[PDB]
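Closing statement on the magnesium ion sub-project.
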Amino acid sequence: TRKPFIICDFDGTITMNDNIINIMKTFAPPEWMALKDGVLSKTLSIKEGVGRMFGLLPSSLKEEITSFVLEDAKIREGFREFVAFINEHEIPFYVISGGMDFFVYPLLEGIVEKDRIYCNHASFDNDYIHIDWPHSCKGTCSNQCGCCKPSVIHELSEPNQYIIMIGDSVTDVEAAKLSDLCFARDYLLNECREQNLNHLPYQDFYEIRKEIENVKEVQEWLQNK
Ligand SMILES: [Mg+2]
Ligand SMILES: [Zn+2]
């Protein structure tokens, strides 16, 4: 049998909204939209665009931003029960995200351990917010992703695993192409349908857990116990 291996995005997938976007709408000058549009058009890399977006913001905003995000962000229904199911079955599980640990960590506290969280780091030691990118592109990726999901997936997975990707962003199509099944919303769902990637839509993680359990290859794997 083939062991399941699950990777899951954070902003817009685990949370209802894109926390980077909401930070920018709330604190950034209008120029942030031009940077966003450059990332969308592929004029700017993710790393370059996101870096420049956070670099609009004075580090003196640390606590207001942190406070804003933790009260703004809402976790999608069923997520806790889903991680409990992962744990119950000892399924490899990783959150791989372009977000910043100053909000990803507190939002996942008591649910996901830090060795399962691959995200970027925002520093507040300079005049303007600075990003460190500890999981950047290696190997065959040279796309300046910032947090390189394909590179992390190749690093962590093993031969013959049944790779399940869960996401929402159109920029995670390369990760979805590596999956045997993609749970997709929003523009990622359109990309999976367009490129004929094996996929399923989802409203919440109750639905995700139910569907995962009844994937043939997952059932086979479980029924060795
Ligand atoms: Mg997302
Ligand atoms: Zn990359």
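The CA atoms of residues 84 and 111 lie 8 Å apart. With this model delivered, the sub-project is considered complete and its resources will be redirected to Aim 3.
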